[PDB]
RNA sequence: CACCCUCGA
């Protein structure tokens, strides 16, 4: 899942690398 | 001196112009463009400029 | 290798979608008839649509009405989806009065004799406790797409709100051809036309309008000079 | 213009200004990218005009320390092991260590898979180094880019030029009437929209007590209530429409920090700078010739690319020498038909549609008798205030939505000498027109060269006509392969896909998360910058695209589909790349950029026509254009341009008279500007004189 | 030996450059004759010695320049350099 | 034609509309007519059409680099608010459609309307005044469509078959109309080779002679042709009577055809033929299947198998540097040469991997636009990228835009990209400044006389004869021989003269000399025109735009300045060398010259360089002093061997460049004379412009050099 | 629905068998809708007669040269394929052409059986040399459009018979283009321009009338469903 | 109108 912090729509990401720190 | 003062070094040109008391023969494209005369080129040269057109004597009835 | 006349048969897929088979057609002719019928259907089919609206508490589009969730711009967009048919061929007024709380749909409209709404369940607005909605809707009959008539060009005053009119009742038209290219004396095309409408008219009625359109139009070539 | 533009503006880094340097004092070395900009200043987002390199955008994860330098985060590598310990380093601090690129293969525990890894080293030196040498590594792949740049899908496949243009044009997007979030995204849309501040986020958790188009009241759990007011049809600094709409409904549980209402270019909290358009990549009868764009009239009929623009008009009533200007409906020698839309004060009423030239505020100013023309005085005798009404400028037209009046008589504090002030707000609903400028996210820009009817457009197998036709020739030269990829994935998002799970997971989708093996139509996906969808996975997804409602697969595994020419009917001979691309409406519309002038104001000193559309000025026939005329030999046209059409005080008037009389054009006179030149040379103690053929000086 | 000239391309510019010495001279010929024709249309109701009217048959609402340019093509004018 | 909005024309023609509204009694007086126009009453739109009728306007797009940056058009009232421009003039304006804006000017005076109608109409300005080659021609999509339908497909359906077995010849059509019907049913492909009986197209002059010959082919005479239906459709576009061309219409071929049409056929014929080509080209570019897709961007199959080699040669140098066997500064050049060969081998691996069905190959190979190097970066590899310093980075960009750049790969591409944009802005600035200087120095250079009668001309190396006997075309024929006029009778080995004096060396007229064996001509030059003020027409030559002798009064000086300053936008020697030449500076090279013809005295050492010359006739030794950091030019020594490095004993002539570099023109003047220094400047500048792909005719450069040497100094009053 | 009035059809005669037709003005964008349909109907849906196959005496397996004539077999077939003919009999009809001695073979030298009619008796076919003899049999059928010879493979008997491409359509070449015309204020209306070149069997006026009649019936099949509304 | 900013081909 992409951007699972505020309650946003579930945008699915082709991400291979995990995000250790959020923007 | 008017064609040169409008190119580069305006003050340096006008100083020399005033010292030499130079007279500008208003006969050049840049100069006539500045003062609004017809450029001495193309349709401005004296061969084409002063021309009178008159119809041949053939004419319609009315 | 001589003419047989072509036959047209209808196949019903849904209540608002039909396939038409035209056969036999000259080789290469199927695609052209599909395209000609499609172009006439998508742009020259008579329908009815809302010409203008008028909300009491508003004067222009760029405002809000107290108690409703949608602003006037969103109300007009939601009203653009309204499918309606009219028998009058002259301007006719529909009315809508509804008090909140609740949801205002296309079924809450009261159509005068001659006009009819075909999807009463369309969402229009959400009214809270303090919501009240009073709307007049002027519906005319036409074809194609005509922009919202200006008030400077019309005699309408300030309280009138013009809207874009999407008259066309047809939704989607496509076609396919099955060619018989068996290297013999008999080659021929079979056309399959696909017509889907918006419950304003049946696909057969749309195709009939297009057929009358083209018959009348092509009649111009028969007259000599 | 749109929330992203404002955000980027607030995150700008400008080299110009006091204490810094002058623009003339900036060589080719201050402007190019420096190896220390990594993770601090974006190397892409920068203007391409005379300010290139002087203005940058702060990187995403970058911050500023109390000293003033820009820090960026890095993951500390202990003993060849990636750690979640994050430390912010400055430039010089970063140079004292060596950092690995973000996309290094890492073990699930933290150990690097390959012994050699890409590493950045002091003085901007890039090389491979053993795994036992890496001290830190990058946080995220997108660590080096800006906010806007991180918003370009498949950014890794676009050259820096077209990428620069894409990021810079995203900030030029126009807020549409209704906003649609893009199918193909990057992940940055959400936080960009939220942190921009043009949405409405709930400060504290609670439930929605009462929601209206005007405001939203939230009843917290503790008992307190907070009401957020929506900004409706507000004029932005650049004329765009800032309009907030509630998303939640009455009695909806909402958590803290959730978007309860989104504004312009926003959809459920994500930046929606444009629309998802069905695109076909093919030449079409020359209407899209080199970078021109063809659009379907559907986008006009359904207000897909319609946008709202608001203009502010202003007028004041001052105290004059002969009295005081009064704003009145009573205007001399004006019919009751033009004044029909004005209230009793001379102000236009709300809701009235006004064309250019129509009166908005009727103001008359008293003029003295000694200022009247002899013909004007006679016309006054053969039959004291003059018309200074506020008229609509040329090219403006819309609905009057708001009026604001300030009166010195009514406590309103106006500048000394003003008695009344009126501001009229005019709103226009601009549909997409021939010549408006659209663009994608990859610097793929173009104007609208033709809007064909919905039936003329090349349509897919199932009858759906495409929406936009882009010429193919202007694609492979610019090196913006992104759009191509973006196109393909776009279609896969519109139709959905279903990967063959039986007999194991295929070999291409082994690296895809399990959440992607199945997708419904109109699915939302993210292609993170420098990560995200790889060409192999995209190939596979095109292989497993969902069929339509009739059960037919329209596009091939190559991504192309068979289209039918809506004008002739014959199917196009070859398959065509068809997909969905996110297209934005840029703020460069013919409705604003069109201009023409017969006559109008002239500068008092030089007596030459004014400049700019707002001043009703004329176009400047510059030096190079005079060279063009001379090269053609069009002597008479050049003289005409520089005399009767410009600053010949008597010549231009006689030209006007000769036109309205039907007579021939008179002979041009002397430019007044040259008279000024002579007087200026005299002011410097230079005796300039014009001599005739005989030698006598002439005055 | 060419398709029908349409609009402003008539008379053909190639035939026009045969009755004249250069591109530049033809301009003056056409323009001064157009001035004569305009004076004719402005002095038709008043005064004598009016300049010679349209030699050829003018089309309905044809610009004086076009009429003069066709007269040049039909070898109906002289010159004086 | 051009299409302007209604609201633009209404304001532009406001007074005219007022006049005609008050004439037709739509308005009581002219005042109320003004009010009507300002309120935009519906009567004006019907009246406006009468006003704009055949009233030309001028379209201008800044920057106005050359005179074709402004052209006249007939205005057409269009709805909307954008100007509609013809697709063929885009090249002249250098105008794309991504937000470009154009300015419109309304000529008012009758003289102004005539100047716009005759001098500035777009149809009368098809050719570039700088080079003579056409500009308003099929350029992008049009050339692609034409290259499509004029392509021979061997296996296409409907192909001609020879008579064999029980069936006679298959694929032999009696009329092109029959071929059209066959293609309509779906039997014949437009690109299939067939035999067609043509009756309205002149056959090639090759076959017209053997088939007819005695009498020219007549409209109606039939003949068989082995072409495709598409090529026949193409040959109907160009005028009747043009020899049928059975070629594949590459861009070069179309430019050649239109150039021949401009040379032979009149203006208007070309103006209409190119519009026909435009229509056909768009029609078939729509149906050429030209499309971009990720699959059509084929990466080399052995790409990894190609790349690890060069990564590995890059690894080579690291230990010849670890043990100190290579210097750190030499390593960089080594690795640069490593990867530069990579890009070439990858290009060869790309050309064969790309099929011909590939739309990118159809775009590039058809001459539409773009090079194959772009296709290497797109499909092969970006390669070595340069940092803002200048030297190539010892580490390349291995990835392709299809594969996906790494984070650092993109960041490292950005140095070069941004500096590209920056130095492009700076290059444009310097170019424009040079342009205005050149304009002012030659603004008053006008053609005032017909023929100055001077024998003075200059010798042009028409061709060079190979030792075996074959003649090699000189690469400078295009820029030095065309549009010239002769200054010496052309003589072959026989007494027959090939070209008389004063005959504009056209294309066939050059073929005459080339097939005659003569390899040198003496042509009239503006350098040699001995006129008091202006220049003669005979020495100037053919007006590159008009295709004929220049008319008296044309400001050829401004035309030359603009022709030279327009391509200055694309340069790297370089543009500063152009400035060094035009400003008469003491050059960087500062190459010495032989003040007296004689015997060379090579006295080379290592401390320094000193060279003397012993005069071949009388005189005294002439000594020089040069640094050993220069190098001797391989002078075409008397031995007839061009690779004769200057050693002692050679017989050099007076004014011969000794060591490589750039000789000081100031000394060339006081050595060889004004004529030779003029020639030196001309071809030394032309080297700079030709080594970059820019073709400027020597005429324009000579016009400037003529102004550089008009003055002399005073020794004694 | 209501009306859309003033569409007129005008003819310009270029030759005795070639005309341009202008339909003007049409609602946007009906010119494109009907133009291609009219062109295809003209080229494919007009009854005509043409030669299906032939048989030349002395040619059984060579199909290369005929002794005594200047033209080879393919050129003979080409000049015979341009022969214009009309037939009133629906079934195939056999014609003969025989001429011996030096001279010229014309289309008038053909003997048409009862029912068929040759409309170009002056078409050159071949030049006969000294002592030259040419005998050929011609099969004439009725059809429409253009059907290739390969499908006519059966019409040639395995005894010298050669099938030829059949140009059944009486029209030869049709093109069309559409321009924009502004009737009142908008410049959206379409103006259709048809260019038709036919054979001397029928005039362009009658050809266009035949195509129009066929198309009227064709769309009348759609009109006969419900019958509702559209203007005149 | 003087400077200033941001931007477009």
D424 by DSSP, 3-state: which?
A: strand
User: Would you state the torsion angle of the CA atoms of residues D125, D130, D132, D133, taken in this order, to the nearest 10 degrees?
Assistant: -10
Helices (H), chain C: 29-43, 72-80, 203-222
Q: Assess whether F271 and F299 both reside in one domain.
A: no
F9 by DSSP, 3-state: which?
A: helix
Tokens coding E79? 């010159």
- The burial class, CB within 10 Å (0-12 / 13-18 / 19+), for F400 is buried
Q: Assess whether G11 and G36 both reside in one domain.
A: yes
D670 in contact with B, Cβ within 8 Å:
yes
Tokens coding D63? 């911050």
Element at C141 (helix H, strand E): strand C132-143
F273 by DSSP, 3-state: which?
A: helix
Which of G132, G211, G127, G134 shows the shortest CA–CA distance to G169?
G211
- D191 vs D189: CA distance, rounded Å: 6
| Amino acid D584 CA to nucleotide H6 C1' distance, rounded Å | 20
| Amino acid B36 CA to nucleotide H7 C1' distance, rounded Å | 36
Contact call for F111 and B40, based on CB within 8 A: no
Which of B34, B35, B33, B50 shows the shortest CA–CA distance to D669?
B35
What domain range is F158 assigned to?
Answer: 141-287
Which of C124, C92, C94 shows the shortest CA–CA distance to C109?
C94
| Contact between chain C and chain D (3 or more Cβ pairs less than 8 Å apart) | yes
Task: Kindly list the partner chains of chain G, i.e. chains with 3 or more CB atom pairs below 8 Å.
Answer: C, D, F
Q: Assess whether C68 and C53 both reside in one domain.
A: yes
Helices G204-223 and C29-43, interaxial angle, to 10°?
Answer: 60
| Contact between chain E and chain A (3 or more Cβ pairs less than 8 Å apart) | no
F345 by DSSP, 3-state: which?
A: helix
| Amino acid D570 CA to nucleotide H6 C1' distance, rounded Å | 50
Closest chain E residue to the Cα of B43, Cα to Cα: E24
Contact call for F168 and G63, based on CB within 8 A: yes
What domain range is G102 assigned to?
Answer: 48-168
Q: Assess whether C118 and C173 both reside in one domain.
A: no
Where are the extended beta strands (E) located within F118-252?
172-173, 195-198, 223-225
Contact call for G223 and C205, based on CB within 8 A: no
Task: Indicate the pairing of strand D82-89 with strand C165-166.
Answer: unpaired
| CB distance D457 to D610 below 8 Å | no
Give CA E26 to chain center in angstroms. Answer: 10
Those residues whose C-beta lies under 8 Å from the C-beta of residue G155, and which sit 6 or more positions away, are G52, G53, G139, G161, G163
CA distance to partner chain D, nearest, from residue E1 (Å): 29
Give CA separation, D148 vs D9, D43, D59, D166, D188, in Å: 11, 12, 10, 9, 8
Interface residues 549-608 of D with strand H (CB < 7 Å): 588, 603-605
Q: Which of B49, B50, B54 sits opposite E78 (nearest CB)?
A: B54
CA distance to partner chain C, nearest, from residue F230 (Å): 20
Dmax (CA) of chain F: 102
Q: Assess whether F270 and F370 both reside in one domain.
A: no
Number of domains in chain G: 2
Mutate to test the interface with F, among D466, D472, D584 (most CBs of F within 10 A): D472
Neighbouring CB atoms inside 10 A of D505's CB total 15
F113 in contact with E, Cβ within 8 Å:
yes
Give CA G28 to chain center in angstroms. Answer: 31
Q: Assess whether F233 and F356 both reside in one domain.
A: no
G39 by DSSP, 3-state: which?
A: helix
Interface residues 610-669 of D with strand H (CB < 7 Å): 610
Paired strand residues for D21 = D16
Q: Assess whether G33 and G58 both reside in one domain.
A: no
- Nearest protein residue to nucleotide H1 (CA to C1' distance) is D603
Please tell me whether F221 is known to bind a ligand: no
Q: Which of E23, E24, E39 sits opposite D664 (nearest CB)?
A: E39
Give CA separation, F417 vs D159, D223, F376, F392, F414, in Å: 8, 58, 17, 14, 5
- G212 vs G218: CA distance, rounded Å: 10
Please tell me whether F452 is known to bind a ligand: yes
| CB distance D296 to D452 below 8 Å | yes
| Amino acid D14 CA to nucleotide H8 C1' distance, rounded Å | 21
- C163 vs C208: CA distance, rounded Å: 29
Those residues whose C-beta lies under 8 Å from the C-beta of residue B7, and which sit 6 or more positions away, are B13, F440
Q: Assess whether C100 and C11 both reside in one domain.
A: no
Give chain C's radius of gyration (CA, Å). 23
Element at C94 (helix H, strand E): strand C92-99
Tokens coding D445? 């820009």
- D284 vs F284: CA distance, rounded Å: 9
The last residue of a domain, from among C150, C167, C184: C167
B61 in contact with E, Cβ within 8 Å:
no
Q: Assess whether F150 and F283 both reside in one domain.
A: yes
Which nucleotide is at minimal CA–C1' distance from F101? H9
F62 touches strand H (CB under 7 A): yes
Q: Assess whether C143 and C197 both reside in one domain.
A: no
Tokens coding F574? 């370089």
Contact call for E7 and F54, based on CB within 8 A: yes
Please tell me whether F90 is known to bind a ligand: no
Task: List phi, psi (to 5°) of F559.
Answer: -60, -40
Which nucleotide is at minimal CA–C1' distance from D604? H1
Element at F344 (helix H, strand E): helix F328-353
Task: List phi, psi (to 5°) of F319.
Answer: -95, -30
Mutate to test the interface with A, among D526, D530, D541 (most CBs of A within 10 A): D526
Tokens coding D433? 């027109």
- D98 vs G14: CA distance, rounded Å: 84
D18 touches strand H (CB under 7 A): no
Q: Assess whether G180 and G84 both reside in one domain.
A: no
Those residues whose C-beta lies under 8 Å from the C-beta of residue F423, and which sit 6 or more positions away, are D28
| Amino acid D212 CA to nucleotide H6 C1' distance, rounded Å | 37
D168 touches strand H (CB under 7 A): yes
What domain range is E41 assigned to?
Answer: 1-81
- F391 vs F378: CA distance, rounded Å: 23
B58 in contact with E, Cβ within 8 Å:
yes
| Amino acid D47 CA to nucleotide H7 C1' distance, rounded Å | 9
Helices F43-52 and F30-39, interaxial angle, to 10°?
Answer: 110
What is chain D's percent helix, strand, coil content, to nearest 5? 20, 30, 50
| CB distance F102 to F83 below 8 Å | yes
Tokens coding D4? 């992203």
Which nucleotide is at minimal CA–C1' distance from F99? H9
Q: Assess whether F298 and F279 both reside in one domain.
A: no
Task: Indicate the pairing of strand D576-585 with strand D274-281.
Answer: antiparallel
Q: Assess whether F242 and F327 both reside in one domain.
A: no
Element at D677 (helix H, strand E): helix D672-683
Q: Assess whether C26 and C91 both reside in one domain.
A: no
Give chain F's radius of gyration (CA, Å). 31
- F704 vs G2: CA distance, rounded Å: 72
User: Would you state the torsion angle of the CA atoms of residues F437, F441, F442, F444, taken in this order, to the nearest 10 degrees?
Assistant: 120
Q: Assess whether F275 and F178 both reside in one domain.
A: yes
| CB distance F93 to F61 below 8 Å | yes
- G182 vs G189: CA distance, rounded Å: 6
- F382 vs F343: CA distance, rounded Å: 8
Q: Which of B3, B28, B48 sits opposite F553 (nearest CB)?
A: B48
Q: Assess whether G24 and G57 both reside in one domain.
A: no
Task: Indicate the pairing of strand F75-78 with strand F2-5.
Answer: parallel
Reduce the secondary structure of D97-154 to three states and give it as a string. CCEECCCCCECCCCEECCCEEEEEECCCEEEEEEHHHCCEEECCHHHHCCCCHHHCCC
Give CA separation, C218 vs C4, C33, C177, F601, G189, in Å: 21, 13, 23, 97, 17
Q: Assess whether F280 and F304 both reside in one domain.
A: no
Q: Assess whether C98 and C128 both reside in one domain.
A: yes
User: Would you state the torsion angle of the CA atoms of residues D690, D693, D695, D699, taken in this order, to the nearest 10 degrees?
Assistant: -40
Dihedral sign, CA of G25, G26, G28, G34? negative
| Amino acid D14 CA to nucleotide H6 C1' distance, rounded Å | 12
Tokens coding C188? 């021929």
- G132 vs G135: CA distance, rounded Å: 10
Which of C118, C155, C103 shows the shortest CA–CA distance to C16?
C118
**CATH number, domain containing residue G197:** 3.30.1360.10
Nucleotides of H under 7 A from a protein CB: 1, 5-9
Closest chain C residue to the Cα of D304, Cα to Cα: C77
- Nearest protein residue to nucleotide H8 (CA to C1' distance) is F99
F187 in contact with G, Cβ within 8 Å:
yes
- C81 vs C119: CA distance, rounded Å: 10
Paired strand residues for D564 = D459, D571
Dihedral sign, CA of D322, D325, D326, D330? positive
Please tell me whether F98 is known to bind a ligand: yes
- E59 vs E66: CA distance, rounded Å: 10
Mutate to test the interface with E, among B40, B53, B60 (most CBs of E within 10 A): B53
Those residues whose C-beta lies under 8 Å from the C-beta of residue G115, and which sit 6 or more positions away, are G87, G88, G89, G93
DSSP-derived letter for residue F237 is: T
Paired strand residues for C105 = C123
Q: Assess whether G153 and G175 both reside in one domain.
A: no
- D534 vs E25: CA distance, rounded Å: 68
| CB distance G83 to G123 below 8 Å | yes
Q: Assess whether F307 and F418 both reside in one domain.
A: yes
Which of D50, D34, D22 shows the shortest CA–CA distance to F426?
D50
| Amino acid D196 CA to nucleotide H4 C1' distance, rounded Å | 27
- C214 vs C211: CA distance, rounded Å: 5
Q: Assess whether F309 and F241 both reside in one domain.
A: no
Q: Which residues of C touch F185 (CB under 8 A)?
A: 27-28
Neighbouring CB atoms inside 10 A of F714's CB total 5
- D694 vs D699: CA distance, rounded Å: 14
Q: Assess whether F182 and F213 both reside in one domain.
A: yes
Give CA separation, D175 vs D167, D229, D267, D274, D590, in Å: 16, 20, 12, 8, 17
G32 in contact with D, Cβ within 8 Å:
yes
| CB distance G179 to G193 below 8 Å | yes
Task: Kindly list the partner chains of chain E, i.e. chains with 3 or more CB atom pairs below 8 Å.
Answer: B, D, F
- D456 vs F307: CA distance, rounded Å: 48
Q: Assess whether F161 and F283 both reside in one domain.
A: yes
Q: Assess whether C70 and C21 both reside in one domain.
A: no
Give chain B's radius of gyration (CA, Å). 20
Give chain D's radius of gyration (CA, Å). 32
Task: List phi, psi (to 5°) of D227.
Answer: -115, 120
The last residue of a domain, from among G124, G146, G168: G168
D162 touches strand H (CB under 7 A): no
Which nucleotide is at minimal CA–C1' distance from D615? H1
Number of domains in chain E: 1
Tokens coding F171? 């694929």
């Amino acid at each position: 899942s992409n951007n699972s912090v505020p309650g946003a729509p579930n945008r699915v990401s082709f991400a291979k690398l995990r995000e250790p720190l959020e923007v | 001196w008017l064609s040169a003062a409008s190119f580069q070094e305006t003050t340096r040109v006008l100083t020399d112009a005033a010292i030499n008391c130079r007279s500008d023969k208003l006969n050049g494209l840049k100069e006539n463009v500045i003062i609004g005369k017809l450029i001495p080129a193309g349709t401005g040269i004296n061969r084409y400029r002063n021309i009178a057109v008159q119809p041949t004597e053939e004419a319609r009835a009315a | 290798l001589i003419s047989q006349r072509p036959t047209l048969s209808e196949d019903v897929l849904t209540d608002n979608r039909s396939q038409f088979v035209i056969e036999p057609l000259e080789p290469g002719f199927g695609y052209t008839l599909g395209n000609s019928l499609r172009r006439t259907l998508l742009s020259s089919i008579p329908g009815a649509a809302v010409t203008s609206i008028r909300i009491d508490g508003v004067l222009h589009e760029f405002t809000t009405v107290p108690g409703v969730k949608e602003d006037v711009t969103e109300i007009i967009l939601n009203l653009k989806s309204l499918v309606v048919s009219s028998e009058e061929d002259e301007p006719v007024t529909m009315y809508l009065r509804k008090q909140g709380p609740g949801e205002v749909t296309a079924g809450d409209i009261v159509p005068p004799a001659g006009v009819t709404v075909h999807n009463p369940g369309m969402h229009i607005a959400t009214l809270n406790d303090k919501g009240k909605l009073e709307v007049e809707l002027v519906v005319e009959r036409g074809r194609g797409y005509v922009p919202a008539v200006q008030n400077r060009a019309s005699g309408a005053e300030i309280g009138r709100i013009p809207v874009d009119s999407i008259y066309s009742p047809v939704l989607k038209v496509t076609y396919k051809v099955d060619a018989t290219r068996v290297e013999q004396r008999t080659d021929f095309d079979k056309l399959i036309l696909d017509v889907e409408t918006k419950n304003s008219i049946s696909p057969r009625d749309a195709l009939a309008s297009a057929g009358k359109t083209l018959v009348e139009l092509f009649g111009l070539a028969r007259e000599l000079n | 213009n749109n929330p992203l533009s404002g955000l980027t503006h607030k995150r700008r880094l400008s080299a110009l200004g006091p204490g810094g340097l002058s623009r003339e004092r900036a060589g080719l070395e201050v402007r190019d990218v420096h190896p220390s900009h990594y993770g601090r200043m974006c190397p892409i987002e920068t203007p391409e005009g005379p300010n290139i390199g002087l203005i940058g955008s702060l990187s995403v994860y970058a911050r500023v320390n109390p000293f003033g330098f820009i820090e960026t985060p890095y993951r500390k590598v202990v003993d060849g092991v990636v750690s979640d310990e994050i430390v912010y380093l400055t430039a010089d601090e970063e140079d004292r260590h060596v950092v690995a690129q973000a996309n290094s293969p890492i073990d699930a525990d933290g150990r690097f898979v390959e012994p050699r890894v890409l590493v950045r080293r002091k003085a901007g030196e890039v090389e491979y180094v053993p795994s036992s040498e890496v001290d830190y590594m990058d946080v995220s792949p997108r660590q080096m880019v800006s906010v806007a740049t991180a918003m370009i899908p498949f950014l890794e496949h676009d050259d820096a030029n077209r990428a620069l243009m894409g990021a810079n044009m995203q900030r030029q997007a126009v807020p549409l009437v209704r906003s649609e979030a893009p199918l193909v995204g990057t992940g940055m849309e959400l936080r960009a929209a939220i942190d921009a501040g043009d949405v409405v986020v709930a400060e504290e958790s609670g439930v929605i007590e009462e929601v209206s188009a005007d405001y939203i009241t939230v009843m917290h759990d503790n008992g307190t209530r907070r009401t957020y007011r929506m900004r409706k049809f507000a004029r932005s600094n650049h004329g765009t429409c800032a309009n907030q709409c509630p998303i939640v409904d009455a009695g909806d549980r909402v958590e803290a920090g959730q978007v309860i209402a989104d504004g312009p270019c926003t959809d459920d909290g994500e930046m929606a700078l444009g629309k998802n358009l069905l695109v076909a990549i093919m030449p079409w009868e020359g209407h899209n010739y080199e970078d021109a764009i063809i659009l379907s009239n559907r986008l006009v009929e359904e207000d897909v690319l319609t946008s709202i623009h608001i203009e502010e008009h202003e007028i004041d009533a001052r105290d004059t020498k002969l009295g005081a200007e009064e704003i009145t409906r009573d205007i001399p020698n004006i019919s009751d038909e033009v004044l029909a839309d004005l209230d009793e004060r001379g102000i236009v009423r709300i809701g009235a549609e006004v064309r250019d030239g129509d009166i908005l505020v009727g103001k008359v100013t008293p003029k003295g008798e000694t200022e009247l023309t002899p013909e004007e005085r006679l016309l006054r005798a053969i039959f004291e205030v003059r018309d200074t009404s506020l008229k609509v400028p040329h090219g403006e037209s819309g609905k009057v939505i708001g009026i604001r009046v300030f009166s010195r008589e009514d406590e309103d504090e106006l500048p000394a000498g003003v008695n009344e002030l009126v501001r009229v707000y005019v709103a226009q609903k601009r549909k997409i027109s021939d010549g408006d400028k659209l663009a994608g996210r990859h610097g793929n820009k173009g104007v609208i060269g033709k809007i064909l009817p919905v039936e003329d457009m090349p349509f897919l197998a199932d009858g759906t006509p495409v929406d936009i036709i882009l010429n193919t020739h202007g694609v492979p030269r610019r090196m913006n392969i992104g759009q191509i990829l973006e196109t393909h994935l776009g279609w896969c998002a519109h139709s959905g896909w279903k990967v063959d799970a039986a007999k194991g997971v295929p070999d291409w989708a082994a690296r895809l998360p399990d959440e992607l093996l199945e997708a419904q139509p109109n699915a939302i996906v993210s292609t993170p910058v420098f990560d995200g969808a790889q060409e192999a996975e995209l190939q596979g997804l095109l292989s497993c695209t969902l069929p339509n409602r009739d059960g037919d697969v329209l596009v091939d595994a190559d991504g192309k589909a068979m289209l039918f020419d809506g004008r002739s009917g014959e199917p196009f001979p070859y398959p065509v790349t068809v997909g969905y691309m996110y297209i934005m409406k840029l703020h460069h519309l013919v409705d604003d950029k069109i201009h023409a002038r017969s006559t109008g104001p002239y500068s008092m000193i030089t007596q030459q026509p004014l400049g700019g559309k707002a001043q009703f000025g004329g176009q400047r026939f510059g030096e190079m254009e005079c060279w063009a005329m001379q090269a053609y030999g069009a002597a008479y046209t050049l003289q005409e341009l520089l005399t009767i059409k410009s600053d010949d005080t008597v010549g231009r008037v006689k030209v006007y008279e000769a036109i309205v009389k039907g007579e021939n054009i008179p002979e041009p006179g002397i430019p007044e500007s040259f008279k000024v030149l002579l007087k200026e040379l005299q002011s410097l103690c230079l005796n300039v004189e014009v001599l005739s053929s005989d030698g006598a000086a002439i005055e | 030996g060419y398709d029908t000239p349409l609009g402003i391309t008539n008379p053909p510019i190639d035939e026009l450059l045969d009755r004249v010495s250069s591109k530049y001279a033809l301009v003056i010929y056409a323009a001064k004759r157009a001035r004569q024709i305009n004076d004719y249309y402005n002095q038709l109701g008043e005064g004598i010695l009016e300049y010679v009217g349209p030699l050829v048959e003018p089309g309905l609402q044809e610009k004086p320049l076009s009429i003069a340019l066709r007269e040049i093509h039909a070898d109906l004018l002289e010159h004086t350099e | 034609q051009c299409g302007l909005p209604k609201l633009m024309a209404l304001e532009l023609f406001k007074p005219f509309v007022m006049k005609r509204l008050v004439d037709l009694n739509h308005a009581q007086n002219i005042k109320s007519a003004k009010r009507m126009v300002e309120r935009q009453r519906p009567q004006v739109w019907d009246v406006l059409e009468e006003v704009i009728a055949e009233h030309p306007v001028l379209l201008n797009r800044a920057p106005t680099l050359h005179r074709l940056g402004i052209q006249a058009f007939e205005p057409m009232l269009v709805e909307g608010k954008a100007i509609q421009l013809h697709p063929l003039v885009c090249e002249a304006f250098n105008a794309d459609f991504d937000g470009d804006q154009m300015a419109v000017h309304l000529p008012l005076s009758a003289e102004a309307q005539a100047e716009a109608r005759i001098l500035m109409l777009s149809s009368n300005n098809i050719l570039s005044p700088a080079s003579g080659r056409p500009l308003a021609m099929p350029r992008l999509d049009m050339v692609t469509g034409l290259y499509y339908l004029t392509t021979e497909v061997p296996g296409d359906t409907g192909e001609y078959q020879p008579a064999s077995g029980d069936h006679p010849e298959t694929g032999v059509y009696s009329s092109p109309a029959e071929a059209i019907m066959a293609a309509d049913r779906g039997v014949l492909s437009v690109r299939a080779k067939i035999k067609v009986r043509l009756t309205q197209l002149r056959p090639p002059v090759e076959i017209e002679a053997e088939l007819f010959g005695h009498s020219g082919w007549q409209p109606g005479d039939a003949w068989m042709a082995e072409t495709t239906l598409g090529r026949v459709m193409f040959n109907e576009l160009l005028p009747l009577g043009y020899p049928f061309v059975n070629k594949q219409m590459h861009k070069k071929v179309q430019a050649a055809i239109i150039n021949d049409l401009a040379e032979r056929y009149p203006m208007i014929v070309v103006a209409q033929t190119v519009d026909k080509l435009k229509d056909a080209g768009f029609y078939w570019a729509t149906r050429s299947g030209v499309t971009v897709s990720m699959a059509d961007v084929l990466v080399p199959p052995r790409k990894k198998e190609i790349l690890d080699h060069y990564e590995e040669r890059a690894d080579k140098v690291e230990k010849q540097f670890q043990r100190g066997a290579l210097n750190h500064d030499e390593r960089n050049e080594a690795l640069v040469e490593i990867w530069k060969e990579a890009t070439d081998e990858v290009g060869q691996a790309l050309r064969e991997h790309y099929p011909d069905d590939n739309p990118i190959i159809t775009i590039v190979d058809s001459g539409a636009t773009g090079n194959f190097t772009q296709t290497r970066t797109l499909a092969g590899m970006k390669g070595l990228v340069t940092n803002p310093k200048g030297e190539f980075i010892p580490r390349p960009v291995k990835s392709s835009f299809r594969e996906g750049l790494t984070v650092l790969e993109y960041f490292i591409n950005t140095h070069g990209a941004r500096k590209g944009l920056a130095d492009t802005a700076l290059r444009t600035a310097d170019s424009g400044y040079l342009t205005r200087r050149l304009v002012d120095v030659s603004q008053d250079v006008i053609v005032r006389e017909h023929d100055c009668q001077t024998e003075r001309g200059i010798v042009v190396e028409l061709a060079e004869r190979a030792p075996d006997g074959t003649l090699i075309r000189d690469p400078y024929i295009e820029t030095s021989a065309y549009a010239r006029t002769l200054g010496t009778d052309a003589v072959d080995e026989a007494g027959n003269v090939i070209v008389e004096r004063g005959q504009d060396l056209g294309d066939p007229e050059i073929d005459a000399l080339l097939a005659a064996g003569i390899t040198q001509v003496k042509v009239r030059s503006v350098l040699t025109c001995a006129t008091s003020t202006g220049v003669c027409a005979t020495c100037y030559g053919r007006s590159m735009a008009t295709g004929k002798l220049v008319d008296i009064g044309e400001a050829v000086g401004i035309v030359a300045a603009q022709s030279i300053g327009e391509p200055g936008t694309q340069l790297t020697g370089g543009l500063p060398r152009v400035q060094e030449l035009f400003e008469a500076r003491v050059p960087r090279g500062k190459a010495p010259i032989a003040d007296v013809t004689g015997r060379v005295r090579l006295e080379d050492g290592e401390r320094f360089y000193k060279i003397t010359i012993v005069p071949d006739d009388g005189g005294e030794e002439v000594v020089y002093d040069k640094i050993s950091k220069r190098q001797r030019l391989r002078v075409f020594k008397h031995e007839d061997g061009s690779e004769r490095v200057l050693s002692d004993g050679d017989h050099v002539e007076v004014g011969q460049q000794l060591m490589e570099g750039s000789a000081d023109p100031h000394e060339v003047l006081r050595v060889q004379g004004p004529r030779e220094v003029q020639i030196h400047l001309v071809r030394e500048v032309q080297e700079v412009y030709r080594a970059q792909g820019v073709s400027i005719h020597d005429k324009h450069i000579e016009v400037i050099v003529r102004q550089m040497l008009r003055r002399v100094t005073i020794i004694d009053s």
